[PDB]
Amino acid sequence: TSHRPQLEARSGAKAAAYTPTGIEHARLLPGHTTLKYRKF
RNA sequence: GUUCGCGAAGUAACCCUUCGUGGACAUUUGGUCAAUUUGAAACAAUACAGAGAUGAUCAGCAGUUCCCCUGCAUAAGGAUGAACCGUUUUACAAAGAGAUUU
């Protein structure tokens, strides 16, 4: 019984309460830094 | 200290030097931090066991977590990374029947 289904999810409140560490990820490097706009 | 201006001495010397004076140039660093225990690292040393499904031997991927580690990492690995199993009583009623106090 050590393996179980999921009752509820790990809430993002618990991730919003943690203070961040600055780990510059390999994909959050700046890229596609221009937003294209439509005609109007 | 350098320079500009003035005075006084050497000195009855427009040369030079000294002394005294006013100005200008120059204007507030460094420390979250003290040099062995007593403001905290963890491994290793001893000893014993020695893995999740059950009859055995195992591949795992997951989930929860007020557990993290190695990792550049949103990859991957850490025993499926580890703890998970443990207790377990009231949103509490209604109908009917008999035995009791008055």
From Swiss-Prot:
<protein>
    <recommendedName>
        <fullName>Pre-mRNA-splicing factor CWC15</fullName>
    </recommendedName>
</protein>
<comment type="subunit">
    <text>Belongs to the CWC complex (or CEF1-associated complex), a spliceosome sub-complex reminiscent of a late-stage spliceosome composed of the U2, U5 and U6 snRNAs and at least BUD13, BRR2, CDC40, CEF1, CLF1, CUS1, CWC2, CWC15, CWC21, CWC22, CWC23, CWC24, CWC25, CWC27, ECM2, HSH155, IST3, ISY1, LEA1, MSL1, NTC20, PRP8, PRP9, PRP11, PRP19, PRP21, PRP22, PRP45, PRP46, SLU7, SMB1, SMD1, SMD2, SMD3, SMX2, SMX3, SNT309, SNU114, SPP2, SYF1, SYF2, RSE1 and YJU2.</text>
</comment>
<comment type="similarity">
    <text>Belongs to the CWC15 family.</text>
</comment>
<comment type="function">
    <text>Involved in pre-mRNA splicing.</text>
</comment>
<feature type="region of interest" description="Disordered">
    <location>
        <begin position="1"/>
        <end position="18"/>
    </location>
</feature>
